[PDB]
């Protein structure tokens, strides 16, 4: 068991499991925590960036995909780059060909299908990264959770990475409050920072440690780093 | 056996982790970033006295504004440098400007993932990851003097100072104490020499170690053996002082 | 096609197929190169397991890449031909596009690049060959000697040896080669090359071949008798002590 | 999808053996006996039709096949492998010879093409060797009559007479007793039936035995008249009745 | 001592185990079929078993109309059966297009047997776990039964049977053709040939059949067709008024 | 997937040897011995057919000595089917050369080409090597009479006299003993037969178990002639040398 | 077009090739050397389409030099000419043919005989005592039919080329700006540096 | 025969001041002797303070503008939101045009 | 010996394909889904396990449409289901492009069948980790199908798969007995809601969301449509009243 059935993604275990996919899932858990949440007017990403040394920079975890869509990552950053690039192209294709901003729901379906092809063919490997996609389209604010198994889920709020369960239980309690935060971006970010801090343990949220992103009704997807997020610590 | 792009139970790719071990066996390379420029130094480590040491080329130019130092399987670095040079020159052709150091680094790191045996998504014809780490140093108008550490994992961290190769763990701890934001270029040069001398098996002279830097004014230069010899002499005199 | 990753990393960080290619080189017949002030001399040994060969037609261990550059090797003979052919093609290609023959460093860099590629391409094994490449750049009298190995690493040497018992002859050259004053003549440069092989060869004028390369495409191979004079004159100096 | 088996399935073992070729030869050994005998004015090839059921119609399965008008083949081993070798052998006689030279290939060269096909299934990626030994009998103008054996390795040898399969060791020994360089075709048919009778357990008649000859031209089998140079095929399969005639005076 | 049983390469004894295990798969459905030739028709009988009450019985079939003239019954799992069916149909249509006449039963059988032989020699293709019995009234050869298996073997039959209890059907039919001395069922109408087939399946298997326990395919001059439950019931009434 | 069933025919052992080349060489050491001997005025090719029968048609058979060219021939040791593949490509190469330069191909150029094909199956492709060793006998106007050998590694070498197949160690000692540089073809014919006669695994050395060829200047012409000996001619030369 | 003349005498082949390079209304160069040494004893001259002419000659040169290194041996003039003919014959049925005509003058060291080969752009090879390409033949062939002898010395050959060049300078409409003359014999290839006023 | 080009007329005008620049163009769009629209803008704000017009065959003009606008978008994605300087835009547009050297965009472009 | 369950295309000694059987375990592990054939259409329903309050209700849709007249639902690895439906949609478009008519459900069923079967033929792919229930209305009536990982599929009166398949099948069998003359679309929708609720006792530990779709000649014009609003609540109320 396990030993014999985890050599490649093309092999089912005797209980119907896909261990290579499950090992890829484990790369996300080792990844640094990031939180997503939304109301009816805005959607917010908050991420805890990780460094190597005190001499090193903090690995950026948020990537803009279009003016109305973007995502945060936990796991293999190179794989997030590939998937975010694909999403950038799909968003771009929709605009050029149909003059239409891509629905966040359709973006989720496209990621699912792209991840799935890597879980059924020989020689490849699953993607070793998880993604939280936020956006504002023709049906309002949206937040998605992408796992490299191919499973994509629309949520009000969630978290991924190490110790992400803390932030997730907080949001699960705070649900009725933060969903009502309409027409107030600062207050949604506060609720996102209070959630991300639930997953802390090692350190405190410093100025070059924290990264935040916001998208909404009259707000293009925009990333905040450094002194721009000093007012939230 | 087992696929080259297989994940371990812990969530790491076996081939990337194993390549990181090959880099630990490599010669020490050190980078120091300052507001007057970035310094890149390396240990030559000739395997015999009959080896003509100036033929050892572990510091290379990518463009006038970008330089490179390597550690590990140095033969693996050639295609990465060839790619880097072509990227920087190509960017200049398309845009009539210098490529940003970060974008150049990203382009090099895009190569690192492309290994396997016919994986899905695209055609990546490379049997294994690179067995070499790069220290990419340079300058651009937007983010000034920069030092990056490109790994075969495809990640690249920016560093104020960084050591890679055999003496890296000891050298990094030494850089942890000695670096500060207002270092001069001169201080950095001596600081590279000091730490190379500490971790090197052989006694540091102008033949078994090499220095280089990049400045906004003069671009990337490799220091000739005469210039470095004076800096070794100067370093020796300061250490003896106290 | 066939694209199996044959050259891969092991847990300790080694690529066993490259390192096993080196073991093929170790088994190969010894080869040595030493630079003079005005020449480079390439010495190789010949086996004596089987004797009854036609030396007129049997391929020699020293091959011309161009009129001014030569390449010897240690390891798999069949593998060496592929490198030599590719080197020669690239030499003519260079003359065609640049309108100048290759530098010795460039020719070496090319061969080393080929070898490196065979360490991270699917479906192929590394070359079981290390080469010594020697000659003079166009319009230049500064002698050049380079060495490549299966990994794709290359570098220049004042003198170097490869193949079986190369540890011994390298030890000889490390003590007997002076850098401040290298062999000033073609004669005494050859003598040192023969002296170094005599540590390993054990009796044989037919077991040693030597090529002398000088500036401006002046390359020649020595005959049995010419070499035999060096062997005889060296042995007489030992006895007078 | 994609034949990702681009590597050999036949490789050398430490002793030098090519395992799959040996194992293919072992498959041939279990196969029903077939033989060939070369006379001065013809060649005969014969084998037992071992039916897999009495409900089967053994007329619908021919173990003896025409390749060209002057060339015939029989085998021992796996039948399905033989069938596709015949298809390929017939075709290659056209594409690689008749469409170029406007005449059918001589026996040795058609044998050579079949042998090449079999050699390739011993070295190419992702295949096993053919589990059959063929006996090919034929005639051509400049070489006269000839008989060849072809093995799973792709090796082939010319024979005066031989047998392959189940009882080939005994059969060869019996042929060495009876063969000479002055046999007429009818004498060879007789030697062939005697030899084959030692191999068959059950019924031995024109319905259980299959037998063909390469001999004289059969203008009655050509299908047309008018061209003097076209005199008809030299290959002829004997009928059930024609075999029984020679068994009554056996 | 292991991987020679996983792909189609020779074992030390010259055997192909994956071919032998594919034969095993043919019996997985626990269904018996048989085929007999008439004077100018060919009939195939196959047991129909519908265990689940939630199934639509009209979709549970192992008989296929390959062409206007050819019919095929499969012994083996349905996915492989339909794979073989779809291919045979495509092959049948291509033959008619390229060569200008309907593909004969025996030629289709040879073709499908050649394809099967390929899976037996190439590593990346598995054998199909099926035995295909083709039937027609060939315009040259008359009533025809040709059967192919996972070894790539094929031959024509006077009559044949396939399945777990193949041997009981076979010996029953053998004994009939020894008594009657001929190689077909001497009967002018196909309806009586269907009755013969069903009658001999009942005797051999020692089991009675309702209208829903059987599938029947009939080939005549220029058409192959399958019987409805009511067509079969008419047939089962005929045998009862005589037994 | 497929990876599981791949023998990996082109890898090094820890000792730096190619497994499949070594195992192919082992295969060839069981093959019938073939000998080549070069004289001043020609070359001799002699080969032993291992495993024969009374019914094997020798007149038609040709399993060891093959013609590549009017001026070049080879003796085979190993898998015959493998050899014929290589023979045929060598024949095409010689004709391409002739078509290109309007000159017959020099012997070494043909040998190098064929040996490079072998080397390929050794370094890439994942296929088994050809289980063959060739002795090449030929003549051109640059080097005159030449003898070469190639084995499955793709390495080739030049010889005055050489053996391939079984008992090469014994055969090469015997040749090294009785060979001299100023020999004549007729003396070489004797040497080759004597040497086979001593190394044979059979009882005696009869005509029906041999193939024999000479590449001579033709005695009376001025150009080269390739003689492949017929069974009766081998039976005659076997009596002359004193082995009836 | 450009002037390309060849003449095989007793012990050498002499090639004469015009020096002009003209594009439209302007003579761009008057010292052009329309020749490449393919090996120490084989020389090829060329004329035809602007770019194709040098590209082809250099490509041939590269190939013969490659052969020389590989084999450590110089190919015969006959072998080199056959190789050249085959390359031209390939290109004539290709997408964009080489429009180049050549003469190949060589000294066969094995035969100790000079040899001259005329090959046109179609791959039409022929071995001649004297040869020309383009319109120049229309004047020179008849001139040489009269005055040529097979036993002529190299010096008598040069006098005979002078007669050809004078006739072309008299009757040809183009100013081809004189010729560069080269001799191919057992000692290799040398240029007659003083033909302008010989 | 199908003619892949047309002529949509109109005219454009670019003048550069000391600390400003203007790019102007009429809004008429025509085919032969007919008006297609009296108001069809052909001068566009492409981001990064760059204005652009590609006048002549409008379908090629729109395609070029569209591609250049997309080029600006990706320049931000690939170079950390760096501003595309006017000289850099100009060189970029050269390659967009020369890419179709053997099937040209039938326009006169001004930025 | 052993090891027969490591590669996809490999037959075990008893004629089985263990990798397909292991794929079934992935399906058995999944959510319960059903199909109900009524007298002029088909109804589909599925259980959606609510992991947390954070899942947006009524979003995360699981039932998928193919062309305009076919509904598909599946249990097991959801991505594999989507992959299958994407293929189905490509396949239905192709059929319509060539033949003009919308693809008949039997024709469509075989298209999925042949594709799923193809993924049991080679070791370079793994089988589908879903059983798919699907169908709709065509020229001659309604059709319901279930397709397993082996590629096996049949027509059904009612179908169930996933964790609670035994409960569902038991309820489905009661409806077939007690409504022999035929059920209506209105009834089948309510009856499907009941069965999903009764089947949810197997996953009773966590909360769930109901999803229903239907394709009926009289109720939807033969087009696939989702059940929303007042009709969905009516079905939920019916199931809650029946559970007590």
Curated annotation (Swiss-Prot), chain B:
Signal peptide (from-to): none
Subcellular location: Cytoplasm; Nucleus
CDD domains: proteasome_alpha_type_5 (cd03753)
Keywords: Cytoplasm, Nucleus, Phosphoprotein, Proteasome
Gene Ontology CC annotations of this record: nucleus; proteasome complex; proteasome core complex, alpha-subunit complex; proteasome storage granule
InterPro entries on file: Ntn_hydrolases_N (IPR029055), Proteasome_alpha (IPR050115), Proteasome_alpha-type (IPR023332), Proteasome_alpha_type_5 (IPR033812), Proteasome_asu_N (IPR000426), Proteasome_sua/b (IPR001353)
Residues with the Phosphoserine modification: 48
Phosphothreonine modified-residue sites: 47
Entry superkingdom: Eukaryota
One BP term from GO: proteasome-mediated ubiquitin-dependent protein catabolic process
Effect of residue 41 to D: In DOA5-1; slight decrease in activity
Sequence similarity: Belongs to the peptidase T1A family.
Function comment: The proteasome degrades poly-ubiquitinated proteins in the cytoplasm and in the nucleus. It is essential for the regulated turnover of proteins and for the removal of misfolded proteins. The proteasome is a multicatalytic proteinase complex that is characterized by its ability to cleave peptides with Arg, Phe, Tyr, Leu, and Glu adjacent to the leaving group at neutral or slightly basic pH. It has an ATP-dependent proteolytic activity.
Additional remarks: Present with 17100 molecules/cell in log phase SD medium.
Name of the protein this chain belongs to: Proteasome subunit alpha type-5
Organism from which the protein derives: Saccharomyces cerevisiae (strain ATCC 204508 / S288c)
UniProtKB/Swiss-Prot annotation, chain F:
Source organism: Saccharomyces cerevisiae (strain ATCC 204508 / S288c) (Baker's yeast)
Transmembrane segments: none
CDD domains (UniProt xref): proteasome_alpha_type_4
Record-linked InterPro entries: Ntn_hydrolases_N, Proteasome_alpha, Proteasome_alpha-type, Proteasome_asu_N, Proteasome_bsu_CS, Proteasome_sua/b
Recorded family membership: Belongs to the peptidase T1A family.
UniProt xrefs under SMART domains: Proteasome_A_N
Pfam families: Proteasome, Proteasome_A_N
UniProt lineage: Eukaryota, Fungi, Dikarya, Ascomycota, Saccharomycotina
Positions bearing the Glycyl lysine isopeptide (Lys-Gly) (interchain with G-Cter in ubiquitin) cross-link: 99, 198, 230
Alphabetical keyword list: Cytoplasm, Isopeptide bond, Nucleus, Proteasome, Ubl conjugation
GO BP of this protein: proteasomal ubiquitin-independent protein catabolic process; proteasome core complex assembly; proteasome-mediated ubiquitin-dependent protein catabolic process
Gene: PRE9
Note: Present with 17100 molecules/cell in log phase SD medium.
Name of the protein: Proteasome subunit alpha type-3
Assembly, per entry: The 26S proteasome consists of a 20S proteasome core and two 19S regulatory subunits. The 20S proteasome core is composed of 28 subunits that are arranged in four stacked rings, resulting in a barrel-shaped structure. The two end rings are each formed by seven alpha subunits, and the two central rings are each formed by seven beta subunits. The catalytic chamber with the active sites is on the inside of the barrel.
Localisation per UniProt entry: Cytoplasm; Nucleus
Cytoplasm in keyword set: yes
GO (cellular component) term, any one: proteasome core complex, alpha-subunit complex
Keyword hit for Kinase: no
Origin: domain of life: Eukaryota
Swiss-Prot record, chain G:
Record flagged with keyword Transmembrane: no
Protein name as annotated: Proteasome subunit beta type-4
Main location: cytoplasm
Cited function: Non-catalytic component of the proteasome which degrades poly-ubiquitinated proteins in the cytoplasm and in the nucleus. It is essential for the regulated turnover of proteins and for the removal of misfolded proteins. The proteasome is a multicatalytic proteinase complex that is characterized by its ability to cleave peptides with Arg, Phe, Tyr, Leu, and Glu adjacent to the leaving group at neutral or slightly basic pH. It has an ATP-dependent proteolytic activity. This subunit has a chymotrypsin-like activity.
MF-aspect GO terms: endopeptidase activator activity
Similarity remark: Belongs to the peptidase T1B family.
Highest taxon of the lineage: Eukaryota
Compartments where found: Cytoplasm; Nucleus
GO biological process: proteasomal ubiquitin-independent protein catabolic process; proteasome-mediated ubiquitin-dependent protein catabolic process
Keyword annotations: Acetylation, Cytoplasm, Nucleus, Phosphoprotein, Proteasome
Keyword Transcription: no
N-acetylmethionine modification, residue list: 1
SUPFAM superfamilies hit by this protein: N-terminal nucleophile aminohydrolases (Ntn hydrolases)
GO cellular component terms attached to this protein's record: cytosol; endoplasmic reticulum membrane; nucleus; proteasome complex; proteasome core complex, beta-subunit complex
PANTHER family reported for this sequence: METALLOPROTEASE TLDD (PTHR32194), PROTEASOME SUBUNIT BETA TYPE-1 (PTHR32194:SF2)
Further details from the record: Present with 21800 molecules/cell in log phase SD medium.
Modified residues (Phosphoserine): 76
From Swiss-Prot, chain I:
GO-annotated molecular function: mRNA binding
Entry keywords, A to Z: Acetylation, Cytoplasm, Nucleus, Proteasome
Keyword Signal: no
Modifications made to the protein after synthesis: The alpha and beta forms are probably products of the same gene with different post-translational modifications.
General remark: Present with 12000 molecules/cell in log phase SD medium.
Function: The proteasome degrades poly-ubiquitinated proteins in the cytoplasm and in the nucleus. It is essential for the regulated turnover of proteins and for the removal of misfolded proteins. The proteasome is a multicatalytic proteinase complex that is characterized by its ability to cleave peptides with Arg, Phe, Tyr, Leu, and Glu adjacent to the leaving group at neutral or slightly basic pH. It has an ATP-dependent proteolytic activity.
Subunit structure: The 26S proteasome consists of a 20S proteasome core and two 19S regulatory subunits. The 20S proteasome core is composed of 28 subunits that are arranged in four stacked rings, resulting in a barrel-shaped structure. The two end rings are each formed by seven alpha subunits, and the two central rings are each formed by seven beta subunits. The catalytic chamber with the active sites is on the inside of the barrel.
This protein's name: Probable proteasome subunit alpha type-7
Species of provenance: Saccharomyces cerevisiae (strain ATCC 204508 / S288c) (Baker's yeast)
Gene name of the record: PRE10
Shown segment, full-protein numbering: 5 to 248 of 288
